Ligand binder design. Structure first.
Ligand SMILES: Nc1nc2c(ncn2[C@@H]2O[C@@H]3COP(=O)(O)O[C@H]3[C@H]2O)c(=O)[nH]1
Length: 149
């Protein structure tokens, strides 16, 4: 399998960097000059199957939300608060009814600098000072590099 095996790597990060939920959106564009984001797998937890992640998906605009900024350039960026930022999509908040305190923005690409999708993980954590460290950003892009293909 090539779809189920990709989920196996997703469970190891849930206990490595300590997170709540994971999602993966793919790049979709039309010939009418219109680009959009549509996640195939929605809501991933430690000890869940693909069948439970294949039901109900979220659709976001291109260069609209927090993932749209990273989706446009293709680099690992940090977000201090998505659902409370001036550049976010409030359509997912309607169905998810969840407010994150911090979210990591990291795009999914294949070897050659070619992008295919975007990876974002929302995990509510408490702390004073900064949002994330430089060592935590390397553990996110290294796991997607192998699974990205
Ligand atoms: N609760 C929850 N939200 C998600 C998932 N995938 C994407 N999102 C949210 O969809 C949102 C769209 O607006 P955003 O600013 O990109 O912030 C995005 C995320 O917070 C998921 O699997 N679970």
């Amino acid at each position: 399998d090539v779809t189920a095996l990709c989920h196996k790597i997703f469970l190891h990060i849930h206990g490595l960097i300590s997170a709540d939920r994971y999602s993966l959106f793919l790049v979709c564009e039309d010939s009418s000059k219109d680009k959009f984001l549509i996640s195939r797998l929605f809501d991933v937890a430690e000890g869940s199957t693909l069948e439970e992640a294949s039901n109900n998906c979220i659709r976001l605009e291109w260069n609209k939300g927090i993932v749209g900024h990273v989706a446009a350039f293709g680099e690992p960026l940090n977000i201090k608060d998505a659902y409370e930022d001036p550049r976010f999509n409030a359509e997912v908040d309607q169905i998810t009814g969840y407010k994150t305190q911090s979210i990591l923005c990291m795009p999914i690409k294949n070897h050659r600098e070619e992008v295919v999708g975007v990876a974002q993980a929302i995990n509510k954590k408490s702390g004073n000072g900064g949002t994330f460290t430089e060592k935590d950003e390397k553990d996110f892009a290294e796991y997607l590099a192998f699974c990205g293909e």
